[PDB]
């Protein structure tokens, strides 16, 4: 059963990670930040939290809503690499797959810079540090993809994921790069679905199939709406961008690819209750964030499951996104939407 063999390898991990969640902020703690006046009062209050002295090195003028997002994120990443260090075996695989989705973003981000002729330093600062690999800045060399592939990206673990991508043009531009980026997630989210079904045991298996199904469904919806900006795209092409694991597959991914307008999308999502009313009312992106937290809140009801590492990151990322929103509103003195923060804990 669950707890009989889990603790041999991952007992210490589970305890630290469930201590990292108790430092997640509550609704009462977000209010105390809300009624602050300046950023010097926003610093004193997070000292009372589990953030502590993450800004002790910093003076009055040096405070910005940019420098706060940097040191709140950098505290998540040291905690991640600490846990990934202590891990071994399947748990070390699981924690490497989580990082393969952050370097896909950085591949697409270095390349678009070269098309606009910018310096790597100016770009590397805008790169996410969990998606780092040794030959990342070497992608600044060439624009042809097959050049970039053979010389650099073969050694990477991204090599299997470029099969369906050798249709690029001799010249390379924004809308071509985005199509590449979406083919990778299609192959990444299908390899990391089968990996869980084979090696990762229950009940974490049941929970990660769900959490990865939401990541798939969320993309298939955005990729369709972005296409409405475009002039026209063949239907069989979009079929090569939409993954094949969620609730939408197979019935609705058919009717999404063949959606010419917003109404044609609602005709496709109406036959699924989980996603029925997002388009109908309110901001779309907030509806997903509120459903991500609810699924992660339910992963912590379990025990002896390695899915809490996924749940923990996504929770604390949204924590960071709320801090910055509150911080901008304070400096800019706009306080109409300061209560926009998303919290389930």
Residues that bind other proteins (CB under 8 A): 2-4, 7-8, 11-16, 18-20, 22-23, 32, 35-37, 40-41, 44-45, 47-48, 56-57, 59-60, 120, 134-135, 137-138, 140-142, 150-152, 155, 303
Nearer to other proteins, 57 or 230 (CB): 57
Q: Which is nearer to other proteins, 55 or 269 (CB)?
A: 55
Query: Would you say 35 or 334 has its CB closer to other proteins?
Result: 35
CB nearer to other proteins: pick between 143 and 239:
143
Q: How far is the CB of 136 from other proteins (least distance, A)?
A: 9
Nearer Cβ to other proteins (192/304):
304
Residue 165: CB minimum distance to other proteins, A: 19
- How far, rounded to the nearest angstrom, does the alpha carbon of residue 291 sit from its chain's CA centroid? 14
Q: Name the minimum Å distance from CB 97 to other proteins.
A: 23
Minimal distance in Å, beta carbon 337 to other proteins? 22
- Residue 39 or 184: which CB sits closer to other proteins? 39
- Measured from the CB of residue 326, what is the shortest distance to other proteins in angstroms? 14
Q: Which two tokens stand for residue 174?
A: 């924004």
Q: Shortest gap between Cβ of 49 and other proteins (angstroms)?
A: 11
Complex with other proteins: residue 58 or 295, whichever CB lies closer: 58
Residue 295: closest CA among 342, 249, 344: 344
State the nearest-atom distance from the C-beta of 227 to other proteins, in Å: 35
């Amino acid at each position: 059963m669950e707890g009989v063999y889990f603790n041999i390898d991952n007992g210490f991990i589970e305890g630290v990670v469930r201590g990292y969640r108790n430092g997640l902020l509550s609704n009462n703690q977000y209010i105390n930040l809300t009624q602050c006046d300046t950023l010097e009062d926003l610093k004193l209050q997070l000292s009372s939290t589990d953030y502590g002295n993450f800004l002790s090195s910093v003076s009055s003028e040096s405070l910005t809503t940019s420098l706060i997002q940097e040191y709140a994120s950098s505290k998540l990443y040291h905690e991640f690499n600490y846990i990934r260090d202590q891990s071994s075996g399947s748990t070390r695989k699981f924690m490497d797959y989580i990082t393969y989705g952050y370097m896909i973003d950085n591949v697409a981000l270095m390349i678009t810079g070269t098309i606009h002729d910018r310096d790597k330093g100016e770009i590397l600062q805008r790169c996410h540090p969990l998606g780092w690999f040794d030959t990342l800045p070497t992608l600044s060399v060439a624009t042809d993809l097959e050049s970039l592939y053979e010389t650099v990206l073969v050694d990477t673990p991204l090599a299997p994921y470029f099969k369906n991508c050798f249709d690029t043009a001799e010249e390379l531009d924004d809308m071509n790069i985005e199509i590449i980026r979406n083919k990778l997630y299609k192959a990444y989210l299908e390899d990391f679905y089968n990996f869980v079904t084979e090696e990762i045991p229950e009940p974490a298996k049941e929970c990660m199939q769900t959490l990865l199904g939401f990541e798939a469904d969320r993309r298939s919806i955005n990729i369709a709406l972005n296409s409405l900006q475009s002039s026209d795209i063949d239907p069989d092409l979009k079929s090569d961008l939409l993954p094949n694991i969620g609730k939408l597959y197979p019935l609705a991914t058919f009717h999404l690819a063949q959606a010419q307008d917003f109404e044609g999308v609602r005709a496709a999502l109406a036959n699924v209750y989980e996603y029925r009313g997002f388009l109908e009312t309110g901001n779309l992106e907030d509806h997903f964030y509120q459903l991500e937290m609810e699924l992660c809140r339910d992963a912590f009801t379990q025990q002896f499951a390695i899915s809490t590492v996924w749940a923990w990151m996504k929770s604390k990322e949204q924590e960071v996104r709320n801090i910055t929103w509150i911080a901008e509103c304070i400096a800019q003195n706009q306080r109409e939407r300061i209560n926009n923060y998303i919290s389930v804990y």
